[PDB]
């Protein structure tokens, strides 16, 4: 779901623990 | 050849590679009317629907090029700046001097120039009188304008480009009404403009190839832009056939008549049989092969806005590796020059462009992959842009240049951004860790595996399956936890499930047979089962200090009944990960007190009788800044570790109170109001109780986060540390985005020793998930590369590391496949690679 | 849990140079931003790059490997003759002599 309308199209900026 | 590229859907750059950076003319030059300049189509399009001032501040741009140290610099010549009407009569006096002094200094600085004659700034006279690219009389006008630049500039310029992305000139100038001149919905003018733009290039190529190429010995081509698209289904062929028709409609439109065979693609001619103009077979011979190389554009202009492309109901992609693969197959393996590449940032991002580092990191990673692995004949790369400027209909709302320019400043100083420092090192190196260690571990090393909450001697069925799993491994220990809510259902000592305590005893007693010395965890919370007994959770759970008093009563119950065989104890398992589950500091307050009461109960009463060790396991994920060129990420790198490790360490290890850095930072947020919360202040008694209540250090290390800075809003815990995290698609990640970064544990084991003295350290949880169920190649690479790092810290940094526990011995049906054994308890290949390291005790 | 050993000495004629240095000591100092004061704001470094002055004669650096902030005072005017002390804020962000929790002793400077 690449969002090519924002500066971040990969969702790199920002969610749990493997335990 | 056409139609062959559809098969695409099924570490150092070469020497003498051309590292460069490019700009336009309308975005960067400015001074749209100074020195007798003619109006462009955009100048009337902007003023009816300053800037970087590069026309006067050229020496400031020359200093910017020397900073990055590029081999070439791509710039376009403003057509109305030389000839205001487009007709070649006599160039402007001052305008000619600008491009003369520009080309002179670039050659003096060994910067070979690449010039494009048209970058969407067409003189307004040709659009008003003749009609722009609608009337075909401009074909010989652009050839006339090209002849002038071939004469006076050809001696110093050996790389020429005709049109820069002609797809946007026609589709967005006469189809969507987005670009100049701005006419929405004109099917006729779109493909007619695209017709003249192809014919105008061929005339200029045959001009240069026959009239200036002999005595100048240069190249000439055209910058064609495109996008990339992925199918909505890999197995489906119609979804893949729809992607082939998508690239043809945008890239094959202008490439087949120039790089293909001289005519439009078969799909385009069939789709628009009566609208697409006809190329006479005499024109086909005079256009196929009018390109010395293949200039290519891959930026946000062919991705944003949404109406730029026709996705045909498929998924948009940014993978540049397969984008060049499609070009190399459809056009008989040409020599490509990426003339435009890079994304953008919002105007609010001044000089702290963090994403630009990781956006550029992928492209160059994909370009290198194309060159060394896919055998793509790429000889250059053009970063875009050199400095922030006017980005067409987006105006100054976005920033695409590698140099920040304050548009409200009169000096217009070009300050290098975070990507300029990263790109400079990319050029200086033309393309963080350490090699192998080669050494053995100590014979007293604790090789261990780990389970989880084991809800309830050989008659026990569940034990038999787990006992047959600990026989394939050569582990010396075994880490598992107990269900607190299954021994004291009422949460009080009146009801003692003697059957549940007999079950756990048969576990360790059967383990004492197998020789696997156990390590029991009294508490193990998670999102599935919180673990607290129902009356305790009904009575505010961990928010009531009586629950901590209830933990000591439950702790000593397990101490007396299980201390006979168990010599290693863990109170809470990852208590630092309870924040996800002010109203969290007080909950962790009781988690710390409950640990001391459980430790004071063992140190005084049960230590001499059973002669063991007790501690707790903390979440030990290492951190590093997301931008090593922004200082706000470096200070926040330790602020993450203080809010995570030191939160439960400095009390239980060193001082007795919370970490001062964590305690002092929260008050600064509350000072101006950001947080309505405060970290509790401890007295002399509480600090005297928590201090030094551990017998070793236990760590739950999995991966390494990349913290960055941001003024996070809210009064919650995550909003107290002012930290955001960044995932890097470059580094090898896991199915659940666990970035496999081996060198994080070494920097962590070095951080623990420096901060909390020389004590014994245990790694109580270290694993990775993988979709594979029989040949987990990710885990073996994760295991070996991580076990390589702990050996490096032991034999070099002299860290008292004594144990290693793989995360999960088994997994569940719908749970993340973190275990070494299948849901049906079938052995994956990860067990036997573990035995190789355990039997070898490292890597000799 | 941090201490500041603001070392150095100052007693030179007008136009001279000085090499001040404050020794960092305590715990988790990399999350702290340090500054120099004369009270009056002199300079500050957020880690290594972000330098703030109040200019053109002083240079504030921070060799984090040795845990020591420097303050190169070139072309010292006689008006700069006072006591110089170092501080350490709390990670985020403004001078005001209040965002800095920890302070050092101070080095004398006379011109």
Segments making up each domain of chain C, as ranges: 1-111
Distance CA B304, CA C83 (A): 57
Structure-token pair, residue A17: 């623990």
Picking from B304, B317, B700, the nearest residue to A5 by CB comes out as B304
Neighbour-count burial for B494-510, b at 16+ CB within 10 Å, e otherwise: eebeeebbebbbbbbeb
B72-76 and B112-118 strand pairing: parallel
Distance CA B825, CA B179 (A): 62
User: Does the beta carbon of C91 lie under 8 angstroms from any beta carbon of chain B?
Assistant: yes
**Cβ atoms of residues B21 and B65 within 8 Å:** yes
**Cβ atoms of residues C85 and C37 within 8 Å:** yes
Distance CA C39, CA C84 (A): 9
Secondary element (H or E) of residue C21: strand C18-24
Q: How far apart are the first and last CA of chain A?
A: 28
Nearest to B433 by CA among B742, B794, B658: B742
| Angle between the N-to-C axes of helices B744-755 and B777-792, in degrees from 0 to 180, rounded to the nearest 10 | 40
Q: Which residues pair with B382 in a beta bridge?
A: B20
**Cβ atoms of residues C53 and C38 within 8 Å:** no
* Contact partners, residue B667, CB within 8 Å, separation at least 6: B678, B679, C90
Picking from B631, B636, B642, the nearest residue to C28 by CB comes out as B642
| Angle between the N-to-C axes of helices B585-601 and B545-562, in degrees from 0 to 180, rounded to the nearest 10 | 30
Q: Considering only alpha carbons, which residue of chain A is nearest residue B228?
A: A2
Q: Do B636 and C91 touch (CB under 8 A)?
A: yes
Query: Please, what is the Cα angle at B24 between B23 and B30, to 5 degrees?
Result: 110
Taking the CA of residue A16 and the nearest CA in chain B, the distance in Å comes to 7
Q: Which residue has the tokens 């074909």?
A: B139
**Cβ atoms of residues B777 and B788 within 8 Å:** no
**Cβ atoms of residues B213 and B185 within 8 Å:** no
Method: X-ray
Nearest to B2 by CA among B230, B259, B317, B222: B259
Distance CA B769, CA B325 (A): 31
Distance CA B316, CA B671 (A): 46
Neighbour-count burial for C16-41, b at 16+ CB within 10 Å, e otherwise: eebebbbebeebbbbbbbbbbbbeeb
Distance CA B765, CA B700 (A): 5
Phi, psi of B721 (to 5 degrees): -95, -10
- The percent of chain B in helix, strand and coil, each rounded to the nearest 5, is 45, 15, 40
**Cβ atoms of residues B24 and B76 within 8 Å:** yes
Distance CA B809, CA B511 (A): 15
User: Does the beta carbon of B724 lie under 8 angstroms from any beta carbon of chain C?
Assistant: no
Q: Which ranges in B116-165 belong to alpha helices (H)?
A: 124-125, 139-152
Nearest to B300 by CA among B378, B397, B220, B233: B397
Q: Which residue has the tokens 């026309």?
A: B55
The chains in contact with chain A, meaning 3 or more Cβ pairs closer than 8 Å, are B
Structure-token pair, residue B451: 């389970």
Tell me which residues of chain A have a C-beta less than 8 Å from any C-beta of chain B.
Answer: 1-2, 4-5, 7-14, 16-19
Q: Which residue has the tokens 């293949």?
A: B294
Distance CA B223, CA B221 (A): 7
Q: Which residue has the tokens 């909950």?
A: B587
Secondary element (H or E) of residue B637: helix B631-644
Q: Considering only alpha carbons, which residue of chain B is nearest residue C47?
A: B631
Taking the CA of residue B573 and the nearest CA in chain A, the distance in Å comes to 9
Distance CA B323, CA B251 (A): 11
**Cβ atoms of residues B413 and B428 within 8 Å:** no
Query: Please, what is the Cα angle at B330 between B324 and B335, to 5 degrees?
Result: 55
Domain that holds residue B781: 439-843
Distance CA B590, CA B587 (A): 5
What is residue C104's three-state secondary structure?
A: coil
Query: Please, what is the Cα angle at B85 between B166 and B99, to 5 degrees?
Result: 70
**Cβ atoms of residues B220 and B209 within 8 Å:** yes
What is residue B75's three-state secondary structure?
A: strand
| Domain at B600, CATH number | 3.20.20.80
Residue B79 has what DSSP assignment?
A: H
Breaks (C-N over 2.5 A) in chain B follow: 10, 49, 431, 456, 581
Distance CA B13, CA B368 (A): 6
Q: Which residue has the tokens 């020429």?
A: B160
Q: Do B344 and A7 touch (CB under 8 A)?
A: yes
Q: Which residue has the tokens 């105008």?
A: B200
Nearest to B45 by CA among B198, B182, B206, B215: B182
Q: How far is CA B89 from CA B36, B86, B141, in A?
A: 15, 9, 12
Q: How far is CA C64 from CA B42, B630, B634, C72, in A?
A: 51, 15, 11, 16
Structure-token pair, residue B10: 């099924």
Which residues of A fall within a CB distance of 8 Å from B816?
Answer: 18
B723-725 and B801-806 strand pairing: unpaired
Q: Record the resolution, in angstroms.
A: 3.2
CA neighbours within 13 Å on the CB side: how many for B266? 5
Picking from C30, C48, C50, the nearest residue to B638 by CB comes out as C30
Structure-token pair, residue B74: 């791509």
Q: Which residue has the tokens 């009056």?
A: C40
Structure-token pair, residue C95: 């001078």
User: Does the beta carbon of B655 lie under 8 angstroms from any beta carbon of chain C?
Assistant: yes
**Residue B160 CA from chain centroid, whole number:** 35
Structure-token pair, residue C79: 């008006």
Distance CA B311, CA C28 (A): 52
Distance CA B581, CA B526 (A): 8
Structure-token pair, residue C9: 């000495």
Which residues of A fall within a CB distance of 8 Å from B719?
Answer: none
B613-619 and B697-700 strand pairing: parallel
3-state SS string for B240-299: HHHHHHHHHHHHHHHHHHHHHCCCCCHHHHHHCCCCCCCCCHHHHHCCCCCCCCEEEEEC
Distance CA B455, CA B461 (A): 12
C41-46 and C34-37 strand pairing: antiparallel
What is residue B222's three-state secondary structure?
A: strand
Breaks (C-N over 2.5 A) in chain A follow: 14
**CA torsion sign, B575 to B578 to B580 to B583?**
negative
Distance CA B498, CA B487 (A): 8
Nearest to B819 by CA among B766, B765, B777, B769: B769
């Amino acid at each position: 779901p690449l969002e090519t309308d924002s500066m971040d199209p990969f969702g790199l900026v920002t969610v749990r623990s493997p335990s | 050849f056409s139609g062959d590229g559809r098969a695409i859907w099924s570490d150092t750059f070469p020497k003498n590679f051309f590292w460069g950076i490019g700009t336009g003319a309308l975005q960067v030059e400015g001074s749209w009317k100074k020195d007798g300049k003619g109006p462009s189509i955009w100048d009337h399009f902007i003023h009816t629907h300053g800037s970087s001032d590069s026309y006067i501040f050229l020496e400031k741009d020359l200093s910017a090029l020397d900073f990055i140290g590029v081999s070439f610099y791509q710039f376009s010549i403003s057509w109305p700046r030389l000839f205001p009407d487009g007709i070649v009569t006599v160039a402007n006096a001052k305008g000619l001097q600008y491009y003369s002094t520009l080309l002179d200094a670039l050659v003096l600085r060994n910067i070979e120039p690449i010039v494009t004659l048209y970058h969407w700034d067409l003189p307004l006279a040709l659009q008003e009188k003749y009609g722009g690219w609608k009337n075909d009389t401009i074909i010989d006008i652009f050839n006339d304008y090209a002849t002038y630049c071939f004469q006076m500039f050809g001696d110093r310029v050996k790389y020429w480009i005709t049109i820069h992305n002609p797809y946007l000139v026609a589709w967005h100038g006469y189809g969507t009404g987005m670009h100049a001149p701005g006419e929405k919905g004109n099917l006729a003018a779109v493909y007619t403009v695209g017709h003249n733009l192809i014919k105008a290039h061929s005339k200029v190529w045959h001009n240069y190839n026959t009239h200036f190429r002999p005595h100048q010995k240069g190249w000439l081509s055209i910058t064609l832009g495109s996008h990339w698209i992925e199918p909505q289904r890999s197995e489906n062929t119609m979804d893949i056939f729809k992607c082939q028709q998508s690239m043809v409609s945008v890239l094959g439109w202008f490439a087949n008549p120039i790089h293909g065979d001289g005519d439009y693609p078969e799909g385009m001619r069939k789709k628009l049989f009566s609208v697409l103009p006809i190329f006479s077979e005499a024109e086909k011979h005079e256009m196929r092969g009018t390109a010395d190389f293949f200039a290519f554009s891959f930026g946000p202009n062919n991705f944003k806005p949404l109406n730029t492309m026709a996705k045909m109901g498929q998924n948009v992609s940014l993978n540049l590796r397969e984008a060049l693969n499609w070009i190399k197959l459809e056009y008989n393996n040409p020599r490509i020059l990426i003339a435009e590449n890079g994304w953008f940032t919002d105007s609010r991002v001044k000089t702290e462009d963090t994403t630009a580092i990781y956006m550029m990191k992928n492209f160059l990673s994909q370009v290198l992959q194309a060159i060394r692995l896919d055998e793509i004949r790429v000889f250059g790369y053009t970063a875009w842009s050199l400095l922030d400027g006017f980005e067409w209909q987006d105006a100054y709302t976005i920033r695409r240049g590698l140099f920040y320019v304050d548009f409200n400043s009169k000096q217009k100083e070009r300050k290098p951004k975070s990507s300029a420092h990263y790109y400079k090192q990319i050029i200086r190196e033309n393309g963080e860790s350490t090699p192998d260690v080669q050494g053995q571990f100590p014979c007293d090393f604790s090789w261990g595996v780990t389970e989880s909450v084991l809800k309830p001697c050989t008659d026990f069925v569940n034990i038999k399956k787990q006992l047959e799993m600990l026989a394939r491994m050569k582990v010396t220990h075994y880490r598992f936890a107990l269900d607190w809510a299954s021994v004291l259902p009422t949460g009080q000592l009146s009801a003692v499930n003697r059957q549940a305590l007999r079950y756990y005893r048969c576990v360790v007693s059967e383990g004492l047979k197998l020789g696997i010395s156990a390590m029991v965890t009294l508490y193990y919370p998670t999102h599935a089962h919180l673990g607290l007994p129902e009356p305790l959770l009904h009575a505010d759970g961990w928010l009531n200090p009586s629950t901590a008093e209830a933990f000591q009563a439950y702790a000593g119950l397990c101490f007396q009944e299980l201390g006979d065989l168990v010599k290693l104890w863990i109170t809470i398992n990852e208590p630092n990960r309870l924040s996800d589950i002010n109203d969290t500091y007080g909950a962790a307050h009781n988690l710390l007190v409950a640990h001391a009461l459980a430790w004071r109960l063992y140190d005084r009463q049960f230590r001499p009788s059973q002669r063991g060790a007790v501690s707790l396991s903390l979440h030990a994920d290492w951190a590093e800044p997301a931008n090593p060129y922004a200082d706000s990420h470096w200070r926040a790198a330790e602020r993450f570790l203080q809010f995570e490790i030191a939160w439960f360490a400095e009390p239980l290890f060193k001082t007795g109170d919370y970490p001062a850095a964590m305690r002092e930072y929260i008050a600064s947020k509350h000072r101006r109001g950001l947080s309505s919360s405060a970290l509790p202040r401890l007295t002399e008694a509480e600090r005297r109780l928590l201090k030094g209540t551990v017998d070793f250090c236990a760590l739950n290390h999995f991966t390494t986060r990349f913290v960055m800075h941001e003024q996070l809003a809210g009064s919650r815990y995550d909003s107290d540390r002012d930290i955001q995290f960044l995932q890097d698609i470059t580094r090898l990640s896991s199915p659940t985005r666990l970035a496999v970064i081996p060198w994080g544990v070494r920097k962590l084991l070095r951080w623990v020793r420096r901060n909390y003295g020389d004590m014994d350290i245990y790694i109580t949880a270290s694993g990775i998930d993988d979709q594979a169920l029989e040949d987990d190649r990710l885990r073996k690479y994760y295991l070996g590369k991580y076990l390589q790092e702990v050996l490096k810290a032991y034999l070099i940094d002299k860290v008292r590391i004594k144990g290693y526990y793989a995360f999960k011995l088994a997994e569940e049906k719908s749970k993340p496949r973190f275990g070494f054994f299948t849901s049906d308890f079938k052995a994956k290949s990860s067990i036997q690679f573990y035995n190789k390291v355990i039997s070898s005790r490292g890597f000799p | 849990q941090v201490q500041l050993v603001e070392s150095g000495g100052g007693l030179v004629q007008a136009g001279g140079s000085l090499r001040l240095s404050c020794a960092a000591s305590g715990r988790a100092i990399r999350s702290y931003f340090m500054a120099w004061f004369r009270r009056e704001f002199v300079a500050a470094v957020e880690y290594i790059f972000n330098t703030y002055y109040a200019k053109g004669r002083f240079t504030i650096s921070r060799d984090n490997a040795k845990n020591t902030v420097f303050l190169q005072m070139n072309s010292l005017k006689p008006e700069d003759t006072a006591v110089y002390y170092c501080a350490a804020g709390v990670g985020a962000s403004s001078v005001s002599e209040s965002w800095y929790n920890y302070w050092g002793q101070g080095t004398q400077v006379t011109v």
